[PDB]
Design a protein around this nucleic acid. Structure first.
Ligand code: MG
Ligand code: MG
Ligand code: MG
Ligand code: MG
Ligand code: MG
Ligand code: MG
Ligand code: MG
Ligand code: MG
Ligand code: MG
Ligand code: MG
Ligand code: MG
Ligand code: MG
Ligand code: MG
Ligand code: MG
Ligand code: MG
Ligand code: MG
Ligand code: MG
Ligand code: MG
Ligand code: MG
Ligand code: MG
Ligand code: MG
Ligand code: MG
Ligand code: MG
Ligand code: MG
Ligand code: MG
Ligand code: MG
Ligand code: MG
Ligand code: MG
Ligand code: MG
Ligand code: MG
Ligand code: MG
Ligand code: MG
Ligand code: MG
Lengths: 46, 259, 93
RNA sequence: GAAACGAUGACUGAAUCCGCGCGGACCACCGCGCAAGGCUAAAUACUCCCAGUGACCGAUAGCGCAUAGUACCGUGAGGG
RNA sequence: AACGAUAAAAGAAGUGAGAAUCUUCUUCGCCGUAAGGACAAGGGUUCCUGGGGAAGGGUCGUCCGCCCAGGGAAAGUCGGGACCUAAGGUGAGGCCGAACGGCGCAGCCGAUGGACAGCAGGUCAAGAUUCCUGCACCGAUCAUGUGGAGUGAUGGAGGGACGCAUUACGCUAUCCAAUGCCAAGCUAUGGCUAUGCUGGUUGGUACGCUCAAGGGCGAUCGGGUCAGAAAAUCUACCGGUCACAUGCCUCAGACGUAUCGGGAGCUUCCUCGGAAGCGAAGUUGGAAACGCGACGGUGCCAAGAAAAGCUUCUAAACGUUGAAACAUGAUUGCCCGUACCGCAAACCGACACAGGUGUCCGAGUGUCAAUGCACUAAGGCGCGCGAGAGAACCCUCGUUAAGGAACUUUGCAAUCUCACCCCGUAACUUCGGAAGAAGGGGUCCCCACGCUUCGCGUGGGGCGCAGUGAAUAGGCCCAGGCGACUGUUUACCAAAAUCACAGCACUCUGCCAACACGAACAGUGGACGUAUAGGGUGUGACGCCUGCCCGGUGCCGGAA
């Protein structure tokens, strides 16, 4: 019963990361969107 | 020659002259970004590249001596490791009957003797050559394989006739180089390949018949039990003859392409 | 400058009991280097340093409330000097 | 569509003041205008924010929140 | 209903408001190729100490991985970075593109790999190639003496450098035996009085003319310029003279000597149980790696990264008088990780979940062998409800008269068979197989003689119903159908007669190939391939073989 989630810090951070959302503008859209949702918390700090 | 036995196989090949020596790395891959373009080919064992001299021009006027004749993967062609008087070692594909320690002169004035690698205007008619330079300069795109040959037929002005392995006759100008003799690797073709996975030592996972796939996957897909309709590939073109060439420059340099 | 860079001395059983061997244990600025703690321990208490070692450290609890906590987050240095010894008046603790 | 006129992608490629374009196939006549150069307040839209007000709410209502994008759910976008 | 594995408990002592459940003791049982130990991931103080008892804990709780506070984490040498590069990512210029953007040479990023200086011990409640002690090692700057001269590049070279299987020799780790040593004491039960019983029986460094398998080694003079952009004393080649036994070279490891450790225990105060001191001998014989000597040897096809450090050579430059190099002290040593859990109550599974999780170590006895199987060391554990009862029923088991498949969709299930040695073994065969065919015998103990050893052979004697005396442990055969075969597939009702498979055939494609991804006269895959190659399609080992019909549909060819 190998499940789905395999914590791997480097994986997690290299997809999904603040840096990673810089890479692209769909990402940068996500960022601004979230900033706007009210101080949410964000992608790297979690 | 071959090996023969019981325990479930047939026919490996046999080779002399062993070194393991001096050229670049290569790395296997199939897909190219997204969906695999050239199909299958995901298996294979760890080959290395051997830089081989097709051009063989700048060595003009300079004789060489065969060091050894070596096995190279990614090939089907015996390669002779050449050494020149210059000191420069260069891998050149080895033709049939080319011995070890023979002497191969390069350049245009060199006699139509084995391996001597000359242009066509100096090659007497009917003679057998391999490794044929298509456009003067660059290199040989023609007859690089096993047991493959070309026969020179009477030239035109700067241009010569050649019979390529396919049987097709080609206009190729005499300004182009070629190597004397045919390139054997004996007869490679009659190797048995034994069982599967041997086909996997190299390429990978061969034909998956569209007829076992599904309507979603292939035109052949679907139905109840083994059958057919149609007759066509990934996209509806077909097995049998459809001239796939486009009307073009090259097409005027071909005389009687048949087969 | 100098007088910065060390927050407070480590004070605990281990510290003071190791103070007797002439070994002094401070908390320093977490962003600071070994050689910086060295130049700063000398020229503060004015004694030449040989042995130096550093550590980082977590914090992290809550008192109460739905807040849990943040963290404290500190760095800790330990030094042993030459036969020149006995830092300050704090060598008698 | 009887499809004028504007607008370009391809290809042609003019006149210039008794000249040029328009007036909804087109022609004459009668009128209207002078392209292929530029810039240009004001009345106009919006509400993150601020003020005032209300036959608006008053704790299952009113924004989701009498503060929280928190707890919590998700790999993530996201949701709450 | 349930309280999360049928590995199992019992008594005493203690603490306490309260104890089946917390502590201590003594027994019992369970794991022991683990249910022990060490990492990596991941998790975050879960670690240690002192408290606490709402809630969390499937009961209880004085207890906890829970709650509160306080401490604990130490590096020139380990792992990572200031070193290199793989796939991939990126990418000035550059190539494309309605926008956003997609490509891309060099270059740069990127360990899963290359490179690289330390070992032996000690101890906090809690750290350890990190602290301490012992001796050690690498680079860097400076200083003294030798030297008394060249140094050696964003550049060349050599080198780093690489597979699978199998295998000779010598070791060590490491384990075993003993009337070897050393050390403590007793012994009783019937005996033994030590020849019994128990325990320990060496780690680092340095030196050394001692023993030592194995490992790999050529050298200079020289010729051509057409070779490495040029260079070059270097590298490739070519040629000449000294490399047939040697033998320079190297020591794994053993041995010796010394030295620093450690060593069973003994001592001593005991603050309720630790702390400090002291310190015995290390023998002979046997076994032995996947580790070491090594980059060993042999065979094989499917033909086995790159780049930097490294070594050698010059260009430029500075100096040829103060060089390079050596060693002699000295000084110098940055950043990050380092607690604890880590096959699990601490990671992924909503949970203190019978699930999952990459690597390393993993003792002894018996057993052809072994990581198997039984028991068991070290170590860890009895799985956080419990006590009685001994109905129906259910589950997991043990035995069963006579019969023996009559059961039933079907011998489903469950028996039987079961290792090793010997004898023996069919149709059929593609000559390999079928085959562990079938079948029959043996198996323990003692003594004697013999061999080649863990042992075996022969003879005789013995004991039980039984001697792979327990555990691990094939039932077999005759016929067919399907596919030849190994393999693959429906994560979670289908493992097959499906899929693939070597082999066969048709056909396409002459190289900016056909074909395929794609805003794209970009790029890339095909392929650093070239018709003995590549695409597509169908059949499907091997054996004999594959007939008739092209009117229609398609495909190829044709011109009035
Ligand atoms: Mg199907
Ligand atoms: Mg279709
Ligand atoms: Mg069909
Ligand atoms: Mg230190
Ligand atoms: Mg540190
Ligand atoms: Mg118009
Ligand atoms: Mg109310
Ligand atoms: Mg509300
Ligand atoms: Mg019940
Ligand atoms: Mg339980
Ligand atoms: Mg604890
Ligand atoms: Mg409680
Ligand atoms: Mg409770
Ligand atoms: Mg004995
Ligand atoms: Mg006695
Ligand atoms: Mg003994
Ligand atoms: Mg630790
Ligand atoms: Mg569990
Ligand atoms: Mg596993
Ligand atoms: Mg073992
Ligand atoms: Mg064992
Ligand atoms: Mg076992
Ligand atoms: Mg009960
Ligand atoms: Mg019966
Ligand atoms: Mg009976
Ligand atoms: Mg009976
Ligand atoms: Mg019946
Ligand atoms: Mg059965
Ligand atoms: Mg009897
Ligand atoms: Mg069995
Ligand atoms: Mg089958
Ligand atoms: Mg299934
Ligand atoms: Mg199934």
């Amino acid at each position: 019963m190998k499940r789905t989630y395999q914590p791997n810090n480097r994986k997690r951070a290299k997809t999904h990361g603040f840096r990673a959302r810089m890479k692209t503008k769909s990402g940068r859209n996500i960022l601004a969107r979230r900033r706007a949702k009210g101080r949410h918390q964000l992608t790297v700090s979690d | 020659r071959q090996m023969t036995t019981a325990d479930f196989s047939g026919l490996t090949k046999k080779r002399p002259e062993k070194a393991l020596t001096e050229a670049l790395p290569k790395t296997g891959g199939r897909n190219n970004r997204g969906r695999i373009t050239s199909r299958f080919i995901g298996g294979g064992h760890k080959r290395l590249y051997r830089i081989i001299d097709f051009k063989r021009r700048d060595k003009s006027g300079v004789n060489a001596k065969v060091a050894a004749i070596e096995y190279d993967p990614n090939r089907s062609a015996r390669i002779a490791l050449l050494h020149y008087a210059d000191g420069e070692k260069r891998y050149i594909l080895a033709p049939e009957g080319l011995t070890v320690g023979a002497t191969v002169n390069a350049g245009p004035e060199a006699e139509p003797k084995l391996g001597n690698a000359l242009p066509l205007r100096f090659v007497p008619v009917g003679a057998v050559v391999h490794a044929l330079e298509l456009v003067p300069g660059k290199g040989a795109q023609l007859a690089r394989s096993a047991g493959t040959s070309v026969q020179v037929q009477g030239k035109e002005s700067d241009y010569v006739i050649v019979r390529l392995p396919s049987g097709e006759l080609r206009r190729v100008h005499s300004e182009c180089y070629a190597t004397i003799g045919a390139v054997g690797n004996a007869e490679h073709k009659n190797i048995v390949l034994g069982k599967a996975g041997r086909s996997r030592w190299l390429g990978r996972k061969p034909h998956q018949r569209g007829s076992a796939m599904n309507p979603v996957d292939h035109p052949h897909g679907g139905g109840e039990g083994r059958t057919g309709a149609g007759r066509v590939p990934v996209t509806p073109w077909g097995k049998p003859t459809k001239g796939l060439k486009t009307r073009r420059k090259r097409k005027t340099s071909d005389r009687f392409i048949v087969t | 400058s100098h007088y910065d860079i060390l927050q407070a001395p480590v004070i605990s059983e281990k510290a003071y009991s190791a103070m007797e061997r002439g070994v002094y244990s401070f908390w320093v600025s977490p962003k600071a280097t070994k050689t910086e703690i060295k130049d700063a321990i000398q020229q503060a208490f004015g004694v030449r340093v040989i042995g130096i070692s550093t550590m980082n450290v977590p914090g992290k609890r809550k008192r109460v409330g739905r807040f849990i906590g943040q963290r404290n987050d500190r760095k800790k240095a330990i030094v042993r000097l030459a036969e020149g010894q006995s830092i300050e008046a704090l060598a008698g603790q």
